[PDB]
Amino acid sequence: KKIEHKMVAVNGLNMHLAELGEGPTILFIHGFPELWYSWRHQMVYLAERGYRAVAPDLRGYGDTTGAPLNDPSKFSILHLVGDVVALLEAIALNEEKVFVVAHDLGAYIAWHLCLFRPDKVKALVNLSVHFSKRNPKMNKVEGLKAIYGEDHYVSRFQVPGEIEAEFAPIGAKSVLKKILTYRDPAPLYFPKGKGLEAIPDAPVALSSWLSEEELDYYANKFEQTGFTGAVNYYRALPINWELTAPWTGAQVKVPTKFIVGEFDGVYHIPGAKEYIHNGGFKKDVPLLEEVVVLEGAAHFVSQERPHEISKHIYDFIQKFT
């Protein structure tokens, strides 16, 4: 029983989907800059325990085709939730509700799926990115720029072609290696012309979870696709902010478990810890169960602590039968 791959017509895309197992569906939604492949350990673990694990490559990523790279407006949170809703209708026709597990920008998508269509989701496991209450004063790009300045990765990703040109002489493999193995709680910085020089390196032994073969899987895909599709998600943040104004004050009503690594940059955004632990998060997400912080772990928890993540998913979703 190997992982099986197929292509599915969804919301104007030809979407690549990996799938393993039979039983109730768990949809796994990857983040940046990742692929379905980031869920490899979880898919095996949950498939072995009687679930059908499905992990697509998102719009602009891997083997999923059809989104115009030159228009970041087509990577809005509304497009992305549209993709997911369409995917579910296509592949989980007889399950009114499915389990969802998501990481990073996937978790951002998943929060909005749950806001827009709670009728589709049975329970949610989100990793790294907590619910963000929409700030009426300004968009997230402006918020983060005001705090961390123009070199902050989100700011540097904004102008089309600028980050792509920065990465071009470096090559996908080195960029991915540097990002995947990053462990410092500061956000990533890409000062113009400096390549990867503003990104500190951790001791090598701390990235032993990533094999060369795993790294090559990612690098091979991104060499082909480039980074534009992925980076366009961040270029859409300003319009996402405008487009989500209808949900000011709305709660996420899906049962949820949130898990984050101690050294994850998003977890160190000013105010985030307070929001997460001191009640704000629970107020917006009333069925949020106790938050989990993984000691000694950074951003890519599914790959860095696969057993801990797989087990946390399993134990949570077992509560619903």
Unique residue bearing structure tokens 């087509």? 74
From the candidates 83, 104, 264, 284, give the one annotated as an active-site residue. 104
Q: Which of 237, 148, 232 is nearest to 188 (CA)?
A: 148
The separation between CA 144 and the C-alpha centre of its own chain, rounded to angstroms, equals 18
Q: Which of 120, 10, 20, 40 is nearest to 309 (CA)?
A: 40
What is the C-alpha separation between 172 and 149, in angstroms, rounded? 25
Please, where are the H alpha helices in the chain? 40-47, 77-91, 105-116, 140-148, 153-156, 162-167, 172-180, 212-225, 228-235, 237-243, 272-277, 280-284, 301-304, 306-318
Largest CA distance in the chain: 54
From the candidates 234, 267, 275, 314, give the one annotated as an active-site residue. 234
Specify the pairing of strand 25-29 against strand 13-20: unpaired
Q: Which of 117, 142, 100 is nearest to 252 (CA)?
A: 117
Range of the structural domain that residue 309 is part of = 1-321
Task: Provide the token pair at 211.
Answer: 């094999």
What is the C-alpha separation between 56 and 193, in angstroms, rounded? 34
The answer to whether the bond into 33 is cis (omega within 30° of 0) is yes
From the candidates 112, 130, 299, 312, give the one annotated as an active-site residue. 299
Task: Provide the token pair at 232.
Answer: 């366009």
Q: Which of 5, 69, 79, 59 is nearest to 37 (CA)?
A: 5
Experiment type: X-ray
CB 117 within 8 A of CB 89: no
CB 134 within 8 A of CB 237: no
| Termini Cα distance of the chain | 26
CB 211 within 8 A of CB 200: no
Give the 3-state secondary structure of residue 275.
helix
Resolution (A): 2.0
Task: Provide the token pair at 151.
Answer: 């070199």
Q: Is 104 a catalytic residue?
A: yes
Specify the pairing of strand 13-20 against strand 4-10: antiparallel
CATH number at residue 155: 3.40.50.1820
Number of domains in the chain: 1
DSSP lists the bridge partners of residue 146 as none
Q: Is 216 a catalytic residue?
A: no
Q: Is 57 a catalytic residue?
A: no
Provide the residue count of the chain.
321
